[PDB]
Amino acid sequence: TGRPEWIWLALGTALMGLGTLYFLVKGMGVSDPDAKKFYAIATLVPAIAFTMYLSMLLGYGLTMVPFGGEQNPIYWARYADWLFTTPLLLLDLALLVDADQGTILALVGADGIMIGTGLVGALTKVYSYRFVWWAISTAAMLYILYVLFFGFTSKAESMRPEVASTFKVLRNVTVVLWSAYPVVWLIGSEGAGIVPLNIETLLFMVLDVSAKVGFGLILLRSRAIFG
Ligand SMILES: *C/C=C(C)/C=C/C=C(C)/C=C/C1=C(C)CCCC1(C)C
C-alpha cells in the first residue's frame, strides 16, 4: 500500500518498542514490591501501543468511513490502544497519591466513556453527529482532567514533597498532552478533514510517545514509586 503516514507509524512503533524494553529491563531489576507495581503498569502501556502501532504499520486497524461525500480513512486501532493505555496511565497517577477506590473507578469509567464515544464518533456516518459524540467524549475528558487537577493534587499533599512534586509534573504533562487529542481529532481526518492523515499521524505519534514513554521515564526515575 505504502501510505504517506507509514513512516510516523514506523517511527512510533520503534519508540514504543524501545521504551517497553528499557522499562522492562529496569523493572526486572527492582526488588521493592510497589516499585514493581508501578513498573509493571508503566511497561504494559507502551507495550500495548507498540502492538497497535505495529498492527497499523502492517495494514490493520484501518477502516474507510463514509461522510462529507468522501470515503474517509479512520484508524480505529487507535482506540483499541487507548482503551487500555489511558486508564492504566490514570491508575498510575492514582497509586501515586493514594487515590480512593471510588475515585479510581469513576476515573476509569469516565475514561471508558471518553474512548467509547470517541470511537463511535469516529465511525459515525452522519457528518454532524460525528461531532456530537466527539463533544461527549471531550466532556468526559474534561471531567477526568478536573478530577486530576482538583482532586488528586489535593490528595498529593498528604504525601512527601518528593511524591507531590513527581505527581504535579506527571499531572501537568498529562493535562497538556491529553488536551491536545480532541483538537487533533477535530481538525484531522475524523473531523473537519483540514489536517491531512500523514501530518495527523505525526501529531498523534508525538502525543502518544510523549504521554507514554515520556510519562514512564519521568515516573520510573523518581523515588516516589518506592513503598
Ligand atoms: C497513550 C495515549 C494517551 C495518553 C491518549 C490520550 C487520548 C485522549 C485524551 C483522547 C481523547 C479524545 C477526545 C477528548 C474526543 C475525541 C476522540 C478522542 C478519543 C481522540
From Swiss-Prot:
Family matches, as CDD domains: 7tm_bacteriorhodopsin
GO molecular-function term, one example from the UniProt record: monoatomic ion channel activity
Primary location: membrane
Site (Primary proton acceptor): 81
Location in the cell: Cell membrane
Subunit structure: Homotrimer.
Name of the featured protein: Bacteriorhodopsin
Organism: Halobacterium salinarum (strain ATCC 700922 / JCM 11081 / NRC-1)
Taxonomic lineage: Archaea, Methanobacteriati, Methanobacteriota, Stenosarchaea group, Halobacteria
